[PDB]
Design a protein around this nucleic acid. Sequence first.
DNA 1: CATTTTTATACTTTTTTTACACCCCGCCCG
DNA 2: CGGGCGGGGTGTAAAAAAAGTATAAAAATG
Lengths: 224, 223
Amino acid sequence: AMANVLIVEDEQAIRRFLRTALEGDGMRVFEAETLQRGLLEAATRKPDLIILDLGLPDGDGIEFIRDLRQWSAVPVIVLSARSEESDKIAALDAGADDYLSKPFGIGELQARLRVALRRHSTAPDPLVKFSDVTVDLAARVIHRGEEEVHLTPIEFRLLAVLLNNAGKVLTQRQLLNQVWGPNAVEHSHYLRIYMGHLRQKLEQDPARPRHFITATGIGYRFML
Amino acid sequence: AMANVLIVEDEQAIRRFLRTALEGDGMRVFEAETLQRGLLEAATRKPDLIILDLGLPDGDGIEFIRDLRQWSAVPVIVLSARSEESDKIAALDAGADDYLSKPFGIGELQARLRVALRRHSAPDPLVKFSDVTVDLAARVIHRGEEEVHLTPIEFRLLAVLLNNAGKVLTQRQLLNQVWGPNAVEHSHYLRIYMGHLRQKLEQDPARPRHFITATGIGYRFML
DNA sequence: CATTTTTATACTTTTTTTACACCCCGCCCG
DNA sequence: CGGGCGGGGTGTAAAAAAAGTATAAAAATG
């Protein structure tokens, strides 16, 4: 799931800035201090994206882009301290996909990185599991075995607030205040019926609950 | 061969300048002055690229981008007066491919257009369920071998549902993505058009197995 | 004229109400 | 003495009442 970004940069302050930006958005960072090393690692490590500093002293970055483009279609984001239009035009025409002029912020750089990366890429939803039960919170879909089981809105809110507090005990009042609302922080009769429903639908033995545990007198706690 | 570019711009001078500049470099140019017209023209003209000015007073550019992104992957280049980082981020994350602050040089704009075009240059991913085949990018729905005609709203609803396949969407978010932020009250609209979608697409509209109701919550497309 | 919005009514699900069984314990009762 | 007799807190199963949904059809929209 990790996006591999190769930075071609010799300056320590800029490399620090980039590393902060990239690690701040969940990407792995490869580094190269020279253009030649940059090409070598562009080949050997197959980055998903290359950030190139045109202010590299060891040679011409535009020729780096032209050399790279002879055998790779990897997205290239070019950085510069200059503002000259002809540089932008030349770099983009060489095969760069984006061009950032100083000053640039972390936010914009991250956004343009996401833009450049989303072209060569779904990511299934994270499930929560216990027994043979599967809960997809974002999708509001619950499975048990190979069959979907149907939860009503309150049943689902209950299940959710329980899942997000696994192992921890909740007072009937706070369960009520988080599922129903403030107006019924005393209606401690509902939860028995509804937890009864959850137990009925999800537990393998509703009589002896393994996941939906009642803390006698004080409230409830969920396990797994 | 010859690239089609759609410009969504309200200011006359900019429209004329851009038309001259782009036709000069060998592109065929279409223009829209409002966002809704812009969307309609995107849908019918199938442009290779869209240039969108966020300064349009008739609505929300970000909203245009999202709606368009429900079915099209066409490169969108955004022009703006504001140079604030937040608006850039918002537009780019909405689905724009590039962002220029006005005023800009025409040379840079043209280079960026060339980048966007040469990049996006394999067939459309089809969505198949029952006997229905959906091609969002070409805005064409087939049932069996016969084309099914969906109205603009019906297609928008369908596109949102298919884009969130397997997930239940709440009434509020369906309303917000289909009608706009000022219709998040009218759930009956949603019931009606889900009715239409079922009638046109389900084998048995009365007992659907692909367009599912999540009572008290919203709706969901399965498979 | 196609399409969307308003209007009206029959329908299904879900929440809530209402009823009564339980089970581990303690101590009032043969 | 030492077993039935109750009372918190709790679990199931029905009902009645709210809430939310499906569909047709007419009026408005542009």
